[PDB]
Symmetry: D2
């Protein structure tokens, strides 16, 4: 394993939105590094497929698929309860699931705004709380919570269909800093970090533009983009840092963008 | 009327959360300046009370009380419908209603997080959308949307009970900038501004510390609600070609 | 007088870069409101002409021209010494003098970088310091220091020729906040404020003969800030043209 | 070499402020990874000793000490001239030299403010420009400029003795972002990054608190601060990223700080 990842061997990571994109790349990378990974999403079949690939590849870690709709609070609580009932717990929580719906501020549907909040902010916060509560009861003083933010959490770009999304990522910027603060107040060494990528070639733009597949291809064919593996490598760097270092944010963009 | 406020005479402002605090002060100030103000909240009796006082004092504007629970979208849609069919439409929207519940990130209730989002962000966005649509249908090119933000929309203070609240105000910071961009894309001269106060002596802290009113009293024993209303007047009074983006304000020496 | 300006009557405001543009508008507005204003710049002819215009209009205040090159610290200290001697001290400091030079990060001149720092940051900090020390020695507890910043002090626009200038305005954003902090630490009610306008019409453009702010718009924001009751501290006013 | 550092082998990095602290650690790390490093500062004897340590360790890279007072532009120009004539040019520029003097906004000496500007902002900008021009003349399209920023370049802490220093670091935040935009406009793949640490255990606090060395020791004893090697490891991560990735900022603090 990568230098600095030894101490995480066999410890359990949760990766939300592991059925594709960034989350699948992060899950793959943690399993390559010898972690037990619970990966969750709606499209559980993709996670099972990834786990089978990890097993065929001979990786030291294990990917454990779990079906969970993050828009459903009980689904999340049930997942954490299932982990607890099994005498286990999450030591690393990667809050990766997220989405944009093309609901502008001047004419957007309230349902799309709610959907963005439900996953990007509320589910991220419920997972953060439940992961922390499990660490606490297990006397884990050195776990790590990593939120997948965005450059859109730091500046608002003049694309109307992502304005509300950008506002949810601004919330993630503030939540990650507030989290760091509460973990200090609780007198722990549990770490909190954001990773803030620019455009990454995943299914994200295809879901945003679900009524205009061509507009989604052009986000990606026309621009140099990051790859989900690049974000996964940033997560590996953050986890591999020794315990007294707390990476607050890594802002990353495609070169020349 | 204050210089710059003449052009707003008899035009309609919606002020959300007008039943106390900053909202009540903004409503009273706009009525003093000759506007028609629809003031909404759940506690409609207070807003009615502010109307008899406004009226007793012989002010030039009018306060129209309206009962609306902003946590219910259908209630908000009904309100805009009544404004459009009874008062023509809305030219100024002051998104003032907001709250903090003491739900920390490490142990807070999801219900509290949802409640803060529902009023501070969702209702603010629904009202923005409907006010804009009202202006669009009446070919109003010079309306104004003013979001009541907070210094907590620009920095995260180490007070665990207001972390989630702060995150909703960061969302307000981003939405107000997004709004400006959309209004420019729409080729309008409609203006979008936030006002970002530090501590204001209202009922806000008493509600946040509902289980510890002594802590709420310590907060204040600050800016006054009238102070924020004066910032709203300055913003509206500015020439049409000026778009104030934000006014950050704190008590002196705080 | 505008409501809230009464308490500033006959008190002294220093307005740096008063010979045109924002500074001249700010000086005129404060004179109209009955302040004693010291307006400085490298050459005083325009400030003399403004003072004569104010006197002809019957304004209640007075404008006092002072020649000062803000790139020379000794010139600045001499200006404060003169103000202390002849007019008691400074109660309001408007740090308005500023400049942008088109010295890019990849190819710019060091002389241009230094000039921008010298005026935008160092002179502003020297004036801030001397103004505070003036208030302190007179037990003035309610003075006001106002820095004229820029929207470039809050975001970096992809225009190469203003990047270094933008970095100096980010510095001013940080200094204004640090100043607030120090004034609170000193147990005073002296106020500190930034005004951050975007595209303002330049004197250049004006002389040559909405998509722009006018100098008067910035002066009106200064009047709003000063007019706030003493317990209110405006930290920043960000403003841009509606049509920008 | 570390995965990703191979493409930098035998290429030349300039590390300013290499006579101690973070810059000495960065210079050592780059020499370990096989680069040619020009390390400069006023206290050139320290850099000679570091070069001797690196040679003694049998590291693949080489450290070239160079005496340069960064407050003197002619000194910097002569250094770049020497690098050009003797070592072709600069492909990586680490703008590390920096200082804080305890000159508060209300009563500070102007000389302290000018000293902070001269090194933290002016020297950093001069070295950036000359490093870019060095790349340009050699048709280098993949260099890297890394500025050592600070968390104080992102928030103003209520410590009066560091207010002006914080303002110099806000300038670095803005300069790094403007540098990215110019390198993009120049149609290059030259990368621009800053690293923004919280408290790092170096001589920095001792120099800031030159009249109260007890205050400097209290800083480093109250908690397990960042070490210079931790910042060097962040620099190695940034350099090791494939060329299409452009890290914009890494914000890092001591855990629990
Ligand atoms: N791609 C980019 O340009 C970009 C840039 C910056 C940041 N980000 C952030 O990166 C993170 C990952 O997105 P991505 O780019 O990998 O997009 P993606 O390919 O669309 O993947 C999103 C993942 O989130 C999961 N998800 C969405 N809604 C869910 C729900 N209700 N319940 C459970 N899982 C749900 C999806 O799985 P199921 O549909 O199977 O549930 C999928 O696994 C997001 O937070 C996004 O904001 C992306
Ligand atoms: N006070 C401060 O320290 C402070 C500082 C910075 C910013 N702010 C912001 O200022 C704004 C106003 O707050 P305030 O200080 O005036 O607090 P406040 O005294 O508690 O008043 C809040 C108002 O919002 C209304 N409101 C809350 N939930 C509502 C709902 N579901 N439907 C309709 N109305 C609702 C309330 O009326 P009903 O209960 O009758 O519905 C009340 O009139 C908020 O956005 C707040 O975040 C306050
Ligand atoms: N114009 C804009 O688009 C804009 C936008 C945002 C912020 N701002 C800021 O607003 C402030 C005023 O700018 P402006 O538009 O009014 O520009 P301006 O017309 O160029 O005014 C600059 C003023 O500063 C004075 N000045 C410059 N260097 C000086 C020095 N060495 N010593 C003494 N005085 C000096 C000039 O007078 P002398 O040359 O006679 O000495 C002049 O009175 C500056 O801080 C600027 O950065 C301007
Ligand atoms: N230490 C921290 O808590 C901390 C936190 C955040 C960021 N930083 C940043 O990290 C960077 C490195 O600082 P450090 O902590 O390593 O401090 P340090 O131990 O004091 O080292 C500073 C280095 O800068 C060099 N330098 C100073 N003035 C110079 C000049 N005129 N010409 C040439 N070199 C000069 C010094 O060498 P000579 O004296 O031999 O010339 C020394 O090598 C700085 O930019 C600092 O702002 C430090």
């Amino acid at each position: 394993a990568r230098p600095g990842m030894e101490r995480w061997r066999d410890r359990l990571a949760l990766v939300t939105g592991a059925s594709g994109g960034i989350g699948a790349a992060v899950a793959r990378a943690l399993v390559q590094q010898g972690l037990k990974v619970v990966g969750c999403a709606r499209t559980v079949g993709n996670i099972e497929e990834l786990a089978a690939e990890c097993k065929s590849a001979g990786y030291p870690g294990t990917l454990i698929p779990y079906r969970c709709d993050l828009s459903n609070e009980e689904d999340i609580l049930s997942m954490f309860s299932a982990i607890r009932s099994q005498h286990s717990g999450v030591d690393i929580c990667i809050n990766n699931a997220g989405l944009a719906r093309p609901d502008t501020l001047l004419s957007g549907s309230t349902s799309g705004w709610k959907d963005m909040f439900n996953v990007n902010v509320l589910a991220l916060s419920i997972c953060t709380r439940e992961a922390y509560q499990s660490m606490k009861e297990r006397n884990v003083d050195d776990g790590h919570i990593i939120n997948i933010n965005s450059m859109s959490g730091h500046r608002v770009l003049p694309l109307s269909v992502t304005h509300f999304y950008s506002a949810t990522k601004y919330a993630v910027t503030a939540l990650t800093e507030g989290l760091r603060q509460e973990l200090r107040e609780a007198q722990t060494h549990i770490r909190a970090t954001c990773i803030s990528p620019g455009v990454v070639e995943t299914q994200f733009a295809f879901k945003l533009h679900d009524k205009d597949p061509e507009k989604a291809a052009a986000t990606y064919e026309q621009m140099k983009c990051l790859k989900p593996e690049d974000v996964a490598e940033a997560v590996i760097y953050v986890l591999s840092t020794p315990a007294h270092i707390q990476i607050g944010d890594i802002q990353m963009r495609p070169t020349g963008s």
